Amino acid sequence: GSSGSSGVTGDRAGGRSWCLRRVGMSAGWLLLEDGCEVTVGRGFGVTYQLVSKICPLMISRNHCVLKQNPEGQWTIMDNKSLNGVWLNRARLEPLRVYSIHQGDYIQLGVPLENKENAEYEYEVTEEDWETIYPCLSPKSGPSSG
């Protein structure tokens, strides 16, 4: 799939919903609901938790936080990242605003000595809820059950 026309919305769970397509995989898609803060990390309390067996320490609680600035545009901000956050082959700063767009690359942390690119990689893409629903990400925070 991943194809269709965009226009007016008039149906429950309709319209489009941005997200972070996991580069290299077809799962763990972090939904980016318009007007909904998305905090990723490992510590309990974040909307998205990421735990691994190889290097689970590589990620820290609240490694990053997405949100649409008062203007109405999505902006990725790093909550004082320790290892550092990368965006489109660029280093990010702590507590900074970065306007993202379709075709981006968010990297949580730095690559290893035996890994060309960071294990965790995503891509800002706009996909309907019915498209990311099937392959959604592990939500650690609350939700409208």
Swiss-Prot record:
GO terms for biological process: cell division; DNA damage response; DNA repair-dependent chromatin remodeling; double-strand break repair; double-strand break repair via nonhomologous end joining; epigenetic regulation of gene expression; interstrand cross-link repair; isotype switching. Keywords: Cell cycle, Cell division, Chromatin regulator, Chromosome, Cytoplasm, DNA damage, DNA repair, Host-virus interaction, Metal-binding, Mitosis, Nucleus, Phosphoprotein, Telomere, Transferase, Ubl conjugation, Ubl conjugation pathway, Zinc, Zinc-finger. It is found in: Nucleus; Cytoplasm; Midbody; Chromosome, Telomere. Ubiquitous. In fetal tissues, highest expression in brain, thymus and liver. In adult tissues, highest levels in brain and testis, lowest levels in peripheral blood cells. Residues 68-72 are annotated as: Required for interaction with PIWIL1. GO terms for molecular function: chromatin binding; histone binding; identical protein binding; protein homodimerization activity; ubiquitin binding; ubiquitin protein ligase activity; ubiquitin protein ligase binding; zinc ion binding. Its main location: nucleus. Residues 38-92 form the FHA domain. One of its GO terms (cellular component) is midbody. Homodimer. Forms a E2-E3 ubiquitin ligase complex composed of the RNF8 homodimer and a E2 heterodimer of UBE2N and UBE2V2. Interacts with class III E2s, including UBE2E1, UBE2E2, and UBE2E3 and with UBE2N. Interacts with RXRA. Interacts (via FHA domain) with ATM-phosphorylated MDC1. Interacts (via FHA domain) with 'Thr-4827' phosphorylated HERC2 (via C-terminus). Interacts with PIWIL1; leading to sequester RNF8 in the cytoplasm. Interacts with WRAP53/TCAB1. (Microbial infection) Interacts (via FHA domain) with phosphorylated human herpesvirus 1 ICP0 protein; leading to RNF8 degradation by the proteasome. The FHA domain specifically recognizes and binds ATM-phosphorylated MDC1 and 'Thr-4827' phosphorylated HERC2. This domain is required for proper recruitment to DNA damage sites after UV irradiation, ionizing radiation, or treatment with an alkylating agent. Belongs to the RNF8 family. E3 ubiquitin-protein ligase that plays a key role in DNA damage signaling via 2 distinct roles: by mediating the 'Lys-63'-linked ubiquitination of histones H2A and H2AX and promoting the recruitment of DNA repair proteins at double-strand breaks (DSBs) sites, and by catalyzing 'Lys-48'-linked ubiquitination to remove target proteins from DNA damage sites. This is E3 ubiquitin-protein ligase RNF8. It comes from Homo sapiens. The gene is RNF8.
